[PDB]
Amino acid sequence: MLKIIIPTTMLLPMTWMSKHNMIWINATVHSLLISLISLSLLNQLGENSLNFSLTFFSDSLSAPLLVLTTWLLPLMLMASQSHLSKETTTRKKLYITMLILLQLFLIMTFTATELILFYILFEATLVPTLIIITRWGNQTERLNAGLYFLFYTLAGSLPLLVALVYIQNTTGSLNFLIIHYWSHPLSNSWSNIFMWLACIMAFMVKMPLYGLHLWLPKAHVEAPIAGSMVLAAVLLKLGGYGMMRITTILNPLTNYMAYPFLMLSMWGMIMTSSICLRQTDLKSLIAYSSVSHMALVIVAIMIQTPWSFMGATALMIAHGLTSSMLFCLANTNYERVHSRTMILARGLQTLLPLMATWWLVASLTNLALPPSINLIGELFIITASFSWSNITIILMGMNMMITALYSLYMLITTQRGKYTHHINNIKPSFTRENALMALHILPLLLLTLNPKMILGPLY
Amino acid sequence: QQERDPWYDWDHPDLRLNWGEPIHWDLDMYIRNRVDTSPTPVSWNTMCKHLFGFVAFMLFMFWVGEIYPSYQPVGPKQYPYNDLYLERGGDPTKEPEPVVHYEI
Amino acid sequence: AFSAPAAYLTHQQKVLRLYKRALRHLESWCVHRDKYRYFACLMRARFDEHKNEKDMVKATQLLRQAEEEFWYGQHPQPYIFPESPGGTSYERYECYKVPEWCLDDWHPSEKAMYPDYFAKREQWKRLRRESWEREVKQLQEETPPGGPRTEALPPARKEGDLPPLWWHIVTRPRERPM
Amino acid sequence: VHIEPRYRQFPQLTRSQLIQAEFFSATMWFWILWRFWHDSDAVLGHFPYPDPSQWTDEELGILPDDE
Amino acid sequence: PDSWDKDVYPEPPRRTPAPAPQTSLPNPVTYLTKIFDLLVDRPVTLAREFIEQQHAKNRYYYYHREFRRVPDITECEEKDILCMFEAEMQWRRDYKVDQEIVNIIQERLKACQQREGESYRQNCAKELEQFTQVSKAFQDRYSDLGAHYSARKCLAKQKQRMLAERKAAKEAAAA
Amino acid sequence: HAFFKAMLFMCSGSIIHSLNDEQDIRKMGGLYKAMPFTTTALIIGSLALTGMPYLTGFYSKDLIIEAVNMSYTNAWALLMTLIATSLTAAYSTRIIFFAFLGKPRFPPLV
Amino acid sequence: GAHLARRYLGDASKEPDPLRMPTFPPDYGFPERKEREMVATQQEMNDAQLMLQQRDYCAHYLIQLLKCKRDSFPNFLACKHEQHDWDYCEHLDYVKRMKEFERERRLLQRKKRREQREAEMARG
Amino acid sequence: SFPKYKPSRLATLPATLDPAEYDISPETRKAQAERLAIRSRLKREYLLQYNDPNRLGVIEDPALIRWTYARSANIYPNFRPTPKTSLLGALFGIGPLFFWYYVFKTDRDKKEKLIQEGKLDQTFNISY
Amino acid sequence: RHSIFAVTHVLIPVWIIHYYLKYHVTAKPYTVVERKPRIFPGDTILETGEVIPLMKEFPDQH
Amino acid sequence: SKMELPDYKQWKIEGTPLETVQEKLAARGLRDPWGRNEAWRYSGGFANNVSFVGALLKGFKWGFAAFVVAVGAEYYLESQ
Amino acid sequence: GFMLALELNNTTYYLKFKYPSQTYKFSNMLGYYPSIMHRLPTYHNLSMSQKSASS
Amino acid sequence: SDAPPLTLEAIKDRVLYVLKLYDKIDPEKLSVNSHFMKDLGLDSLDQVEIIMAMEDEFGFEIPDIDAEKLMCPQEIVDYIADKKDVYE
């Protein structure tokens, strides 16, 4: 597994020893090659994981997450080099260093065998993200956003640490293989109830769960483009991965402790999806669609069935790709008109025909058009929820209807109608932006032909 | 926004808005791709009474027609081999009760 | 849509608009031309019956009762011209109207075709550049200190002058741009 | 083909369009007449409707009210 | 074809009626079938036979992997991690094999339904009966394990079921 | 239904194009002789739609109405179906009358 | 239908119920009833792949019609006699069902009448 | 004389049926002139930048900025916990959660007690 | 050029699909399943040469 | 192209329902000043038009002639 | 239906003008279904999506 | 194809044709530059009917604010040319 880690670490001295006008080229090429190397982890077994060493292992759940993480870095570098043009050389290298450190932390987080090491890396991912948001964000709110990002997460994860070192003191180990094999039921007691809460709330805040999702519309909106791309595509999935990993110790306590979270998720799906209908900020609309999509992953993980776990894995990957593409698409317009108001620039299909096609495809994948993997994950979760209770079809059905409404609305407001008369600085699309959209959308469509690669360990 | 004059020279023709004018709190609700509050030929509540009455009447008469169905003056359709007992699912090791049809 | 609106409509304007609207809806009800001619002459007679009323209270009351008559008797599906605001071709060609400033972003290979068109465009751009300060000066001098009372714009009063704020009216895309 | 606007007169017509329209209307009417002449039962039925009142009480197994 | 075993994927003997024309009119389907054979099927068979001659020049084999039988979870001690690991791997392989057994039975059922036409409700009784038994056994074996299933949870489920059966059998013997 | 409904929409499109994108029947006058082929096609389509005997429409729709009459059916549904059958001929008549009969009602530049 | 009016507006106890019918034994008035004959065997119908609804005492004529349609395929106007025979057989089946309806109606109007007349001699 | 038309929220009163446009004071005319003047100055201010050759970019519209700011960032600083606000928050935020909890818990309790007594017909239910 | 369209748009696609169905799709069991052919009284089988008996002495009500 | 407008002095309301409108309006003390403008809708090939049943039987005559000749031919040819 | 519709259509040639029935208004405005169902539910949903869900 | 490229002379011809078909205005007296009120002695109500007749002739709707001002056939021709983008 060091054959991926060490090349990623070499991106730092390579970036710092590069010419002033060659950092973007070198970083992009070598991060793409690291993605190529990362593709080898998709060769998974049917029975157990790829146990590289005592420290690192790879499973059918973490391999697609690793591939998405490595694939996202070149796209972030491509999306960042436009608005960082006037920046000094050393600050450009510092921004690229922040991105490389984030990738390194995420790669180790997804493959750590022991839960304390996983916790340390999963918390270390906060520092580069906060620095990115609060140093390179554009507005004065970016400071407050940073605080919201910092303290929502930590207030959730500080109990988790206390739980973890507690568990090792009673079971003897925090190794995930040992934890899974030597698993024992959780009794029905107040102490076990609070241990269950300490093991779960940290991940719930990362998803985030409706009710503790306030930090997200601030952090994603105020962040720079690469910050929001990594926040939506990978950092939200840390909660899903951690919940999937930690659920084994939780049973049979999860059957009754999951009710408040299932109610919050199944209602906040409707709440945030409807919030998207009345949103004057385009980037804020895209951010809220993420909460609406992750409510479904929370439901799938809480109900604890093989179909739900498969659906949650597929939906996490598909949402990562689609939300990253949507944030980039909004940034293309922002770098033209310098405002995130959705109705400021209209009728753009007339002026930018191919970027309109990109918008249409992104909106189609957002509303889970078959046979996209967005739809595969959504439908698997809906089927498992129907098994859990038939009445769920009403809530699930309603969410689907609303999701299509605010997606196409987002399409109709920005692309159709007539272009505003005063704006006259709308330049033709650059090759960089078009390629950035294509490198988002082509892997998404290609994953339809081999969905077993993104369906997790329950396939 | 549909109620405003379409023959005026709006700065924004599609939205029917003028640059610098105060914007209604619910503009995105009223953008005329959406909720319309234009005056109608038939006043509100006149339309509600007629529509609800028509739907309620249709439902009541469908229920009545279910109570008093329509049919033709015939007996049941007759089928030869124990009312196709073996064909309609099988269970060959039961030998069901003879259903017997005679000429009339 | 070309004339500036006034602060209000006078009584004469209101009754004329009512006459035109009632005639159009009557034509919607009377499909055939002879029947329309008959009832339109009856409508004109009904309007002429009070042509020279001098009691403005009585005239206003009569106009109000006429409005109440029209609203009850209006056609729920009036005929609309296809390109009129309610018609079936109202904004059909707006997707084809492209602003002329887009031509500035054409690649030089695109501009290599149509050399005469772009030479004429350069002359038009030079003309627009050269007369802007005179138009601004004219507007400032002509308008009152408080500000302009109405949206009416003045014509060019000197010889080599263009009417102020003319570029976007003149360079309208087209009504059938493609 | 080239026909010009005529401004308040009946439009210019060609020979092919009229003969085609008449030919197809005649074809439809011939088809209707032919099928009615050959397949009348598709409209007027083929079998008569039996009147139950014309069936005797012995045809249906009815006793004379005393047994 | 010799590709698959006919005992595990059976079908009836395929009775096909001989053509018995009654009219003197030409059959368009026969003319089209001759055209299809002469224009489509013959070049396809020629290309396929060329491909097969090229294949026969190089011959190599791949072998189905055979796995030894190892002790199951019942023979493992409480905290003997290595025997638990081997038993769990064997149990997972057996679970996959059982899934594919159910898949084979379901394919038989679907093929019967399509083949029999309008008489499927009667002529597919054997396939429906086989699927009912296989489905009942699979449901008894793996139903309700949930995410995070294991051989230990399956053993606990089986023990609970045997305790229920023993109590039900003791109840009947007292009558 | 596919055949004659598609052809009816085609005839409507022909009328609309020949009248400078006008879709209101109140501005279509006497087109019976001005567009003879369109008139023939639309008349045949309306007759097919109305269940005229031996036409394409007849081999299904007339069999449907009998089937409802010869079934254990909701009485209100049967009455509604018969009334709708009458209204079909009603609106076919409306189209033919207001689009092809009478005197021209379209602008003078033909 | 008239039969609907006589039931929904008149006395419904004088007319048969289409769902609960027949209510009298098949030999209540008839002295000797021969069992209805079937021509096509179960195997023939099964081989023919006829619809379950289609497998009615008229099935042999339908089998002949299907065979005739298949044998003279291009000439789709050759199976007129066979279609006529099958339609005649189905017409006979329908009039048999109408006869059953009428028999049940007149049995039911005779039954209550005879009991109420037996009660008519029991007043005193 | 005729059936009267009464306005509603989603079908408003027409201008020609509004008695305000028929009882006009000199002050009403002064107000209309003032409104026209405000609209006119705004139109002239817009058209001066719109027609400007030199200008390249987006004309910034203070009304749009005020609208978005009021719809997002001005709301919490102008919030007061009042019995109406507290009641609406509690109802609209808490009531649906317990309503759905009750519905789902009742349904699942019924389903589990049916499974326990062996009357559900779970045959062919291999996938969950 | 006379009939080039009918070979690059019909003959070539039907060559690939026929090759695909005959030698790859039908290699797996139950991939192409056909409705059993109808059998009528009097038919002759091409496989066993069996003759189906005729239909039991019609009432001949004519 | 290259065509001009017909003379405006030919549009007379005479013989058309516009005359009837004019008489009915004269019997009321009014006049119709736009009648001649509509006159072209009744003048040329628009002067006469078919009724509903005549439109329905647009090709009945020719089709009937073909039908009767075919029946006459086949009925006597069937007597071989 | 043919006869009744044709007769009612020929009635339009007469020189009489009268105001429409309430049944005609119901038919022409599509049972008022779009005028009610495209205004009341959309308004209430879009109003709650902002007044309570967002604010 | 579609409608021919309508020209200025055609617009003037059609406007004068429609005016000459109006019973109120005599053909000999009418001129392109004739005022509808001073020259022809026509009331405001009468003027509205001319505008509607022009709408029916050219098949498009002229707004009331725009319509009232048109007092000469040349004015109507210029308005129609401006709307249809007619430059010869």
Ligand SMILES: CCCCCCCCCCCCCCCCCC(=O)OC[C@H](COP(=O)([O-])OCC(O)COP(=O)([O-])OC[C@@H](COC(=O)CCCCCCCCCCCCCCCCC)OC(=O)CCCCCCCCCCCCCCCCC)OC(=O)CCCCCCCCCCCCCCCCC
């Ligand atoms: C063969 C055996 C059976 C024989 C049956 C006996 C023979 C036939 C019996 C008579 C059948 C009706 C014949 C005349 C139909 C009416 C046509 C007419 O002149 O309309 C006048 C008038 C509208 O005329 P208008 O407004 O002066 O028109 C102005 C211009 O003409 C505007 O001009 P426009 O260009 O807009 O044109 C308007 C349009 C028409 O104008 C309209 O929009 C109104 C037309 C409505 C006709 C409705 C007929 C079917 C109604 C079914 C409704 C089911 C029940 C719904 C109840 C909802 C209650 C909420 O004209 C047309 O296009 C043609 C109209 C249709 C003619 C052909 C109709 C054929 C189907 C009906 C006959 C079926 C016969 C076969 C039955 C076989 C059964 C086995 O409407 C009516 O007064 C009567 C309409 C019929 C129903 C009215 C019932 C009263 C409604 C309120 C009742 C009280 C409710 C209390 C509350 C309860 C709450 C629980």
Ligand SMILES: CCCCCCCCCCCCCCCCC[C@@H](O)O[C@H](CO[C@H](O)CCCCCCCCCCCCCCC)COP(=O)(O)OCC[N+](C)(C)C
């Ligand atoms: C907005 C987003 C926030 C995140 C949402 C987190 C939700 C956390 C909710 C925790 C789920 C359940 C917690 C404990 C389980 C039952 C709690 C209680 O209501 O049930 C009864 C508990 O009994 C009593 O009710 C005791 C609880 C009463 C005192 C607790 C106050 C709860 C009020 C709600 C506070 C709001 C929670 C969030 C704080 C910010 C059960 O009856 P009983 O048979 O006796 O006890 C059995 C439990 N045993 C086995 C451990 C013994």
Ligand SMILES: CCCCCCCC/C=C\CCCCCCCC(=O)O[C@H](COC(=O)CCCCCCC/C=C/CCCCCCCC)COP(=O)(O)OCCN
């Ligand atoms: C962004 C906001 C997220 C908020 C997350 C905070 C909630 C975390 C859940 C509680 C955290 C503390 C749990 C302690 C770790 C559990 C380890 C454990 O098992 O210890 C228990 C002890 O458990 C406790 O003591 C916990 C009691 C609570 C102490 C601190 C109170 C915190 C507030 C409680 C309610 C809030 C939790 C839910 C809020 C959700 C977020 C809004 C039993 O051990 P023994 O003592 O050995 O018992 C067996 C032998 N006698």
Ligand SMILES: CCCCCCCCCCCC(=O)SCCNC(=O)CCNC(=O)[C@H](O)C(C)(C)COP(=O)(O)O
């Ligand atoms: C289908 C249609 C529905 C029915 C609609 C019902 C409408 C009501 C019918 C009767 C109309 C009236 O009451 S009429 C309105 C009642 N009041 C008056 O008429 C006041 C006097 N008007 C003048 O003095 C002006 O000069 C003027 C007359 C405008 C001419 O102006 P010009 O000459 O300088 O252009």
